[PDB]
Design a binder for this molecule. Sequence first.
Ligand SMILES: CCCCCCCCCCCCCCCCCCCC
Ligand SMILES: CCCCCCCCCCCCCCCCCCCC
Ligand SMILES: CCCCCCCCCCCCCCCCCCCC
Ligand SMILES: [Fe+3]
Ligand SMILES: [Fe+3]
Ligand SMILES: [Fe+3]
Ligand SMILES: [Fe+3]
Ligand SMILES: [Fe+3]
Ligand SMILES: [Fe+3]
Lengths: 164, 164, 164, 164, 164, 164
Amino acid sequence: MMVISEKVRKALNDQLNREIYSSYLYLSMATYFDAEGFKGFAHWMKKQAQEELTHAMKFYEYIYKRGGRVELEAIEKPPSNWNGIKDAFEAALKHEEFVTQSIYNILELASEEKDHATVSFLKWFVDEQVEEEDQVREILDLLEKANGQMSVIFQLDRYLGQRE
Amino acid sequence: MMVISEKVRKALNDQLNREIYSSYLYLSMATYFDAEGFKGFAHWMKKQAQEELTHAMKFYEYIYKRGGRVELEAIEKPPSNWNGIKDAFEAALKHEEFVTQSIYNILELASEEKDHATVSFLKWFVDEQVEEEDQVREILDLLEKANGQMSVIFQLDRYLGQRE
Amino acid sequence: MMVISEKVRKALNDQLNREIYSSYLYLSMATYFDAEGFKGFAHWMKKQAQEELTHAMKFYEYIYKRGGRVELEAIEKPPSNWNGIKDAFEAALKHEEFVTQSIYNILELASEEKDHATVSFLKWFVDEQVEEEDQVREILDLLEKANGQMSVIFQLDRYLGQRE
Amino acid sequence: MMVISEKVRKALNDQLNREIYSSYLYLSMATYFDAEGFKGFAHWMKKQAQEELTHAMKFYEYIYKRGGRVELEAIEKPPSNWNGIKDAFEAALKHEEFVTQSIYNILELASEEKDHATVSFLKWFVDEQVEEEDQVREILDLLEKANGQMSVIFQLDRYLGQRE
Amino acid sequence: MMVISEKVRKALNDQLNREIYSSYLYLSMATYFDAEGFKGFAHWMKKQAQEELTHAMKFYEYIYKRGGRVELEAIEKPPSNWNGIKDAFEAALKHEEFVTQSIYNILELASEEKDHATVSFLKWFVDEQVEEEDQVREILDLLEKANGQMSVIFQLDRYLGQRE
Amino acid sequence: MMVISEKVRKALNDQLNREIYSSYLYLSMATYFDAEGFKGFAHWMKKQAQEELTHAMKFYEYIYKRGGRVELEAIEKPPSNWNGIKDAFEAALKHEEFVTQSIYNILELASEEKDHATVSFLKWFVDEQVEEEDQVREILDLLEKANGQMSVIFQLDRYLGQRE
Ligand SMILES: CCCCCCCCCCCCCCCCCCCC
Ligand SMILES: CCCCCCCCCCCCCCCCCCCC
Ligand SMILES: CCCCCCCCCCCCCCCCCCCC
Ligand SMILES: [Fe+3]
Ligand SMILES: [Fe+3]
Ligand SMILES: [Fe+3]
Ligand SMILES: [Fe+3]
Ligand SMILES: [Fe+3]
Ligand SMILES: [Fe+3]
């Protein structure tokens, strides 16, 4: 029997599908970077897409551990184009902050229901979101300091393509 | 400049999106098996989902090698339930046969345009599809021999749960 | 369900039985060389017989992978005698070319029916036939220069007796 | 010079061709098991086919050691179908006992001619047939206890698929 | 005896000489880059000249395997100068695309004659040409982003100078 | 600034193209040996062809080290046919002696101009030419002792096929 409420279960299932879209969105940024010839930036986004799937699977396993079930929903078409290298990463940061707020909303719902298990489970994502936002802010800061010089952009592309 | 025709490029980009859905469909079959308590079958479907992602990324790589660009499209909601273990694998089998026919159509399109590079590239998927269909047929054959006998179904769940 | 046509399955099953006969034929050439006291040439033919069996088993595996069945047929009695070492290899070259043409006919039949899986599967045998015909031609050209000189035939016997 | 009588050489050459058919017969039993979806039992028959070929090559080497030569004959078409797993292995047992009696006849013929070299050479096959018959009797005994229970047949198939 | 047609042998022999000229052409671009003081770009072209030689030897090997012989023809004088780094690599891309079409013509010729051995042999060059064109397009894209900036050109020179 | 005179650079550039032809000539001798079925002699000529390319690149390096630039010229069609194995190697010897005399002429030209750097650089080729002429003379002496006997020629083919 399910020991999370249907409201909490649906909130968690909604976030799983949101994590799937985040994966799809980052792959779409890879299609943009590859079209612009930045295979290092595209590589960074492909690795980011795979990491987002592990976030989705962590929601997946917790839902079943609490006696629930996952229902996959349609994935909306992501944007394919951005007005430059820095514009894409600014869209990534805005998305991650949106995901952080979505995690907050589940946390507050679970907290009002005294669902301490789900509240505690979400702590990992709260801390992880802090790191996800910082990693994009650092990249954005280096892109701003580059100020469009292919000199620096070439090294940052080579550097981000180095991601394991 | 793109050296594949827009017709061939659209056919390849469509197949990439079909591979993305195939991954999603097998993830949804994993949600079904996990809901039914068969963590070995669910594990098998999760591994199949990741293998379909590598199929999509192969189309991804080739499109850019020929000067094209990938555009990710919306992903339809897959079915979430099946009328049994054998009904799911039968849906998996006919999905894969449909995928083989879709690859066949690109090959014939590429062949009529004398796009030998794409014809040769598609050979790996033709051979791979032979194995994809065969492994599902083997599971269906073992499930039919099982005839819904839990002691045998337990062994196949453990067996498929060992997939690397 | 069989996903190859009955016409193609019979063509593939016929070639399996042809590969079995070729295996048998090379063993019979070994019986001739051993009768003549050339254990190096006989060793080469015994290894060639084993190699043809792996060709037959490759057809075996593909037929079942496509949902078909193998039916073994009677094997004709091969010749037991040849008019010397060079006459045997002249029969071997003529035989390999016959096998190559038999592979060609299956390839063209599968191609007419748009059976791309079988067309792709046969590519391995096409390339292998290039090597097998070349190996016999190399031996025949070296035998032609030998002109029956026993000092050269011994070293070639010792050399071919070293086959892995 | 040949130091075995032509009567003995013919008996040994006939047995060689019998071993070739034995290999072919067990390969045909593999085609039946593979058609029925028991790839473990089919694996057992494919390995058994290889072992019969080593029996043929043992007769091969001895015939030439005694100054004789081998003449390969046509191979009869083996049966392609059996009415069940127990029917196939029971046909295997009766074939092996028929092979044992044929070896007995050579031993008695050779001993009446006081061909002690051939009598002693056949000792290895006499002992080997004891093991060949016993291994089939053991499988038949396990099949009789299984009485068609798929849970038992499944891992008996897996066990015989482990044959080295 | 030659088992490829004279029409196909000449087509293959013509392509071998084409590969020889391409080898010579890339060596000539190295003389240009070295004259301009770019030892990294020159190093890249010297490695490319050697890779083209292995292409020629592959055609060499196959022609003799099919019973033909190679006849070396005169090599035209390649251009010695170019209007810039990007002019050379754009001439390299145009040449490689011309080489691919020459491979396409041989494949279509061989297929019209049902020379399946040559059609299958040429698949390797079809796939290789995809990579040859892709790597030059990548360099052209990096040169376009450099836009003549010596700070960026210095990085691309050292990068291409690291080619093994 | 170029520190060799234009007359010395032209003499060096002419020898570079001469070395390129020497490589091409030995590859042509390989096509003849392969056409005659002597894969050992052909292997020797293929290795010799690769060695001549390193001679050309040595001239390539020295010309640029002295501030000059290389201009590649057209390569004449080499001969494809010889009367026999001993003609090919006798043509190789007289070609190498011609190369030695051409190096002598550059040496005397450079010494007339008191270009001590080029004179000392050429010493390596003077000593190397002694070895190249010697190794061909040894092969010619063994072929003369063979006197067209195929049993001895086969041993020399195998031996020269071992060249590293
Ligand atoms: C090497 C580059 C890899 C890029 C991967 C991009 C993945 C995008 C996925 C979008 C959503 C489609 C459904 C994915 C299901 C994944 C299931 C994983 C189970 C372990
Ligand atoms: C050196 C031995 C050559 C033997 C040639 C025999 C020709 C006729 C053989 C008929 C039966 C062949 C059975 C082959 C079974 C192979 C099983 C392989 C399993 C991986
Ligand atoms: C490192 C620079 C190399 C430049 C090569 C330019 C070649 C131009 C044509 C001259 C003839 C080349 C013959 C090559 C024969 C190679 C044989 C290899 C056998 C494995
Ligand atoms: Fe996330
Ligand atoms: Fe797929
Ligand atoms: Fe064959
Ligand atoms: Fe036996
Ligand atoms: Fe090439
Ligand atoms: Fe030289």
